[PDB]
Design a protein around this ligand. Structure first.
Ligand SMILES: [Mg+2]
Ligand SMILES: [Mg+2]
Ligand SMILES: [Mg+2]
Ligand SMILES: [Mg+2]
Ligand SMILES: [Mg+2]
Ligand SMILES: [Mg+2]
Ligand SMILES: [Mg+2]
Ligand SMILES: [Mg+2]
Ligand SMILES: [Mg+2]
Ligand SMILES: [Mg+2]
Ligand SMILES: [Mg+2]
Ligand SMILES: [Mg+2]
Ligand SMILES: [Mg+2]
Ligand SMILES: [Mg+2]
Ligand SMILES: [Mg+2]
Ligand SMILES: [Mg+2]
Ligand SMILES: [Mg+2]
Ligand SMILES: [Mg+2]
Ligand SMILES: [Mg+2]
Ligand SMILES: [Mg+2]
Ligand SMILES: [Mg+2]
Ligand SMILES: [Mg+2]
Ligand SMILES: [Mg+2]
Ligand SMILES: [Mg+2]
Ligand SMILES: [Mg+2]
Ligand SMILES: [Mg+2]
Ligand SMILES: [Mg+2]
Ligand SMILES: [Mg+2]
Ligand SMILES: [Mg+2]
Ligand SMILES: [Mg+2]
Ligand SMILES: [Mg+2]
Ligand SMILES: [Mg+2]
Ligand SMILES: [Mg+2]
Ligand SMILES: [Mg+2]
Ligand SMILES: [Mg+2]
Ligand SMILES: [Mg+2]
Ligand SMILES: [Mg+2]
Ligand SMILES: [Mg+2]
Ligand SMILES: [Mg+2]
Ligand SMILES: [Mg+2]
Ligand SMILES: [Mg+2]
Ligand SMILES: [Mg+2]
Ligand SMILES: [Mg+2]
Ligand SMILES: [Mg+2]
Ligand SMILES: [Mg+2]
Ligand SMILES: [Mg+2]
Ligand SMILES: [Mg+2]
Ligand SMILES: [Mg+2]
Ligand SMILES: [Mg+2]
Ligand SMILES: [Mg+2]
Ligand SMILES: [Mg+2]
Ligand SMILES: [Mg+2]
Ligand SMILES: [Mg+2]
Ligand SMILES: [Mg+2]
Ligand SMILES: [Mg+2]
Ligand SMILES: [Mg+2]
Ligand SMILES: [Mg+2]
Ligand SMILES: [Mg+2]
Ligand SMILES: [Mg+2]
Ligand SMILES: [Mg+2]
Ligand SMILES: [Mg+2]
Ligand SMILES: [Mg+2]
Ligand SMILES: [Mg+2]
Ligand SMILES: [Mg+2]
Ligand SMILES: [Mg+2]
Ligand SMILES: [Mg+2]
Ligand SMILES: [Mg+2]
Ligand SMILES: [Mg+2]
Ligand SMILES: [Mg+2]
Ligand SMILES: [Mg+2]
Ligand SMILES: [Mg+2]
Ligand SMILES: [Mg+2]
Ligand SMILES: [Mg+2]
Ligand SMILES: [Mg+2]
Ligand SMILES: [Mg+2]
Ligand SMILES: [Mg+2]
Ligand SMILES: [Mg+2]
Ligand SMILES: [Mg+2]
Ligand SMILES: [Mg+2]
Ligand SMILES: [Mg+2]
Ligand SMILES: [Mg+2]
Ligand SMILES: [Mg+2]
Ligand SMILES: [Mg+2]
Ligand SMILES: [Mg+2]
Ligand SMILES: [Mg+2]
Ligand SMILES: [Mg+2]
Ligand SMILES: [Mg+2]
Ligand SMILES: [Mg+2]
Ligand SMILES: [Mg+2]
Ligand SMILES: [Mg+2]
Ligand SMILES: [Mg+2]
Ligand SMILES: [Mg+2]
Ligand SMILES: [Mg+2]
Ligand SMILES: [Mg+2]
Ligand SMILES: [Mg+2]
Ligand SMILES: [Mg+2]
Ligand SMILES: [Mg+2]
Ligand SMILES: [Mg+2]
Lengths: 110, 120, 117, 55
RNA sequence: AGGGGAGUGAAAUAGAACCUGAAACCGUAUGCGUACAAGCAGUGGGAGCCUACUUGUUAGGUGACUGCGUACCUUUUGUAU
RNA sequence: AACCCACUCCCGUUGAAAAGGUAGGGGAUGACUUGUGGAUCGGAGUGAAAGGCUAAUCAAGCUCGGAGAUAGCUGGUUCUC
RNA sequence: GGGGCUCAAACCACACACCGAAGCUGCGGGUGUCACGGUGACGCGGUAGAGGAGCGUUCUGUAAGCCUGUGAAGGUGAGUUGAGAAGCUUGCUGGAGGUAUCAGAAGUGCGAAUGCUGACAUGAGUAACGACAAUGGGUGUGAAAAACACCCACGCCGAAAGACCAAGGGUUCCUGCGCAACGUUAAUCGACGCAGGGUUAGUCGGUUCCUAAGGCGAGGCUGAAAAGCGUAGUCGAU
């Protein structure tokens, strides 16, 4: 089985997004969706759309069932970062890095 | 310490705090159901409940006292005419507070304040 | 003829970093720290090829000492008797008989006592 | 003040061993079957088996 | 936005920030070690466990316990300094 | 009072600010303050004079050339036996 | 040095044994010099420094050759070979070039120079989010609203935090459609993106007329040259 779904350039840092990703690893799809629907973290809203579409890919493309599935694999990679400038005191400039990440969720009946 | 102390500061001055709970109580008697933050909803029942008790006895002295505390002519009219007659035999507890969730903007716990026997 | 260093510099770093396998932290993944660890590991290896011969001889002696006293003799009195009779077996073989061939070690010990030493 | 030596990979990951998030208390509304937060109004408008806000 | 199929192609992990695509750096998975233990982090010795196969005088991974052990460069009469 | 100035305290010192702010403070019809246009400059200008100011630069501005000035002084100097 | 030590595990004489270095010997190898015609003997710590012998990289000849889409260079593992720099053979990736041997030429070998240029860590998910006039509900739109619009109610300025000229800026002005980036948060909003539109003078401000300070200046006077001063003149608003 093992259908995947990826979200590249997710506008959030990887360390922030990995705290949510550890909550759903190995859990069933039915209960992993509830845990994300009642979470205050912003990453839980981004990762809920990736998981919800990985289940859809298992339906149209592989004719699976929602009940059998579970989250076999989930990981968060880094991505491209935007580099900006922040003006500080006494004529000094700081570099700001706006980080992103790649979110990948795999579901499987196995 | 704050042993045995009552009240919530809510990061406002006393004039601001006193003025904000007048608006909430005046809005509550008109809409019968409002949505606010949970900490603010719990400090409102110490303001809006003593006003409903006062309206059970209608007299010039009581209406003047009610207008000094809710400086709204409609709220004084709503009391003494609709509430206080509806709650004429209720030994307190005229408003109900229910947790409803958290705001999107800053994740603040919200609530529903309503009157107990709403016509709805 | 301009010469570019990219290809021979990479093979030279990789030889050092392959010898630093199994080390801790930056000692196995950054070249500057890994080069010093590889050089230091070669100083110890050179020096411990000498200690290895010292540490094993001290181990054989301590075990002949224990085996001789079960037969009623100290290590120094055993070696004096062994040189006196004729016997010239190693310390490495004597320590092996003490553990395993205890009945052969007993015959050698009572041979050394019979030499009146 | 500032560090005299940079921290290692293991040192900074040991400090983050207390950063794991918790799970909320979710109940199932007995009449219908909606999942809500415990002691909170349902996303539909039900609490303890009664319409309260009618959306 | 981004993806899962399907099509084009000799090849899409050649998909437009597109030949090859290293290192620092950041992850997931498996094997072994690790919560009574003091120090340049290695080396001499060394048990147990895991895998492979020519089934143990073999190969690979880990390294409990233990002897010894105060980085490199420069400048100096002389530096763990 | 407006306006011009900067005597004191505290805050700020990675500042809201490469010289400020809040409280008090001095002059306030004059040797006053100010807008617009113009004149004087690098061993030269201007100075109720502090070696002060001349574009956040002054016991001799900035820029391009002589110019890769010179450095008996620090630092560094790359594969093997 | 510690435990601990009293007819000692202290001290004074005598005796026999043992431990103990990379010292010496045994065994197996490599080298320097000298001698003899492969043996023999004496050696082989080393900074500054002198002397001898080599490896590898880029280009040229050998080469109109040899290898290569039945897979070049490059990348990444494994195995093996030398005393070393290093060589050799193969799995996977890659997809078109490489250069035996012996010579010739060098932009010929990097860990350091508070070296130069890019990328990425630690501090750390830490400080901070820019005046302490102040916000509370309802409704609407929307995928989504503390922040957008509208309503009810609060606060703040009011010799300004209101209105208007000049300088300076340059389309920021209005409307429709948008939210990637910009906005120290979100955004459906914007001084942001795209596209359209918008500025009407005999009397307002310029130009035109006149000059101040000052500038330029036909001839002219001066000055190695560039040029300086200046007359008639003509520019120059405040
Ligand atoms: Mg500035
Ligand atoms: Mg950083
Ligand atoms: Mg109490
Ligand atoms: Mg007051
Ligand atoms: Mg290099
Ligand atoms: Mg190790
Ligand atoms: Mg590594
Ligand atoms: Mg430190
Ligand atoms: Mg340090
Ligand atoms: Mg230091
Ligand atoms: Mg880790
Ligand atoms: Mg933490
Ligand atoms: Mg590929
Ligand atoms: Mg790229
Ligand atoms: Mg091509
Ligand atoms: Mg590529
Ligand atoms: Mg890599
Ligand atoms: Mg693990
Ligand atoms: Mg203990
Ligand atoms: Mg233990
Ligand atoms: Mg420790
Ligand atoms: Mg320690
Ligand atoms: Mg060991
Ligand atoms: Mg070993
Ligand atoms: Mg083994
Ligand atoms: Mg050890
Ligand atoms: Mg030790
Ligand atoms: Mg140095
Ligand atoms: Mg010195
Ligand atoms: Mg000295
Ligand atoms: Mg030290
Ligand atoms: Mg040191
Ligand atoms: Mg020393
Ligand atoms: Mg002024
Ligand atoms: Mg002054
Ligand atoms: Mg002063
Ligand atoms: Mg002062
Ligand atoms: Mg004061
Ligand atoms: Mg004054
Ligand atoms: Mg002042
Ligand atoms: Mg006076
Ligand atoms: Mg001027
Ligand atoms: Mg001038
Ligand atoms: Mg000058
Ligand atoms: Mg002076
Ligand atoms: Mg002067
Ligand atoms: Mg200056
Ligand atoms: Mg000078
Ligand atoms: Mg000059
Ligand atoms: Mg120079
Ligand atoms: Mg010169
Ligand atoms: Mg040096
Ligand atoms: Mg080398
Ligand atoms: Mg005695
Ligand atoms: Mg020896
Ligand atoms: Mg020797
Ligand atoms: Mg020999
Ligand atoms: Mg020598
Ligand atoms: Mg010697
Ligand atoms: Mg050639
Ligand atoms: Mg191939
Ligand atoms: Mg080449
Ligand atoms: Mg190849
Ligand atoms: Mg190879
Ligand atoms: Mg070609
Ligand atoms: Mg050639
Ligand atoms: Mg060079
Ligand atoms: Mg070097
Ligand atoms: Mg380098
Ligand atoms: Mg260097
Ligand atoms: Mg060096
Ligand atoms: Mg520095
Ligand atoms: Mg450097
Ligand atoms: Mg961090
Ligand atoms: Mg801290
Ligand atoms: Mg803190
Ligand atoms: Mg803070
Ligand atoms: Mg603030
Ligand atoms: Mg501040
Ligand atoms: Mg603000
Ligand atoms: Mg509102
Ligand atoms: Mg609303
Ligand atoms: Mg706000
Ligand atoms: Mg006022
Ligand atoms: Mg203009
Ligand atoms: Mg524009
Ligand atoms: Mg506009
Ligand atoms: Mg619009
Ligand atoms: Mg934003
Ligand atoms: Mg959004
Ligand atoms: Mg615009
Ligand atoms: Mg005129
Ligand atoms: Mg004139
Ligand atoms: Mg003139
Ligand atoms: Mg003339
Ligand atoms: Mg004129
Ligand atoms: Mg004119
Ligand atoms: Mg005018």
């Amino acid at each position: 089985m093992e259908v995947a779904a990826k979200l590249s350039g997710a506008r959030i840092s990887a360390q922030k997004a990995r705290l949510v990703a550890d909550q759903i690893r190995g859990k069933k799809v039915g209960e992993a969706l509830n845990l994300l629907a009642f979470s205050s973290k912003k990453a839980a809203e981004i990762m809920k759309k990736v998981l919800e579409s990985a289940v859809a890919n298992a339906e149209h493309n592989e004719g699976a069932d929602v009940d059998d599935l579970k989250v076999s694999t989930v990981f968060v990679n880094e991505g491209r970062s935007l580099k900006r400038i922040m003006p500080r005191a006494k004529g000094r400039a700081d570099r700001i890095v706006k980080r992103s990440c790649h979110i990948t969720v795999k579901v499987a009946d196995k | 310490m704050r042993h045995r102390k009552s009240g919530r500061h809510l990061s406002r001055t006393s004039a601001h705090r006193k003025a904000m709970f007048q608006n909430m109580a005046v809005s509550l008697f008109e809409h019968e159901l409002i949505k606010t933050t949970l900490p603010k909803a719990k400090e409102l029942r110490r303001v809006a409940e003593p006003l409903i008790t006062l309206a059970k006895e209608d007299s010039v002295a009581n209406r003047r006292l009610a207008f000094d505390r809710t400086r709204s002519k409609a709220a004084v009219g709503k009391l003494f005419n609709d509430l206080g007659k509806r709650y004429a035999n209720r030994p307190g507890g005229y408003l109900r507070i229910l947790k409803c969730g958290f705001r999107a903007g800053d994740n603040a716990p919200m609530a529903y304040v309503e009157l107990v026997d709403r016509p709805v | 003829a301009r010469v570019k260093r990219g290809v021979i510099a990479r093979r030279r770093h990789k030889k050092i970093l392959k010898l630093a396998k199994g080390y801790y932290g930056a000692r196995s993944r950054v070249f500057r720290v890994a080069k010093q660890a590889v050089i230091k590991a070669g100083q110890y290896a050179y020096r411990d090829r000498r200690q290895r011969k010292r540490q094993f001889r001290a181990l054989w002696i301590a075990r002949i000492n224990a085996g001789a006293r079960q037969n009623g003799l100290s290590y120094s009195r055993l070696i004096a008797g062994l040189k006196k009779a004729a016997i010239e077996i190693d310390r490495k073989v004597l320590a092996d008989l003490a553990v395993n061939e205890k009945a052969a070690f007993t015959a050698i010990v009572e041979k050394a006592k019979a030499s009146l030493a | 003040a500032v560090q005299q030596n940079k921290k290692s990979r293991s040192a900074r990951d040991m400090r983050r061993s207390h950063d794991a998030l918790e799970s909320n208390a979710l109940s199932v509304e007995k009449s219908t079957g909606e999942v809500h937060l415990r002691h909170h109004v349902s996303p539909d408008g039900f609490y303890r088996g009664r319409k309260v806000v009618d959306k």
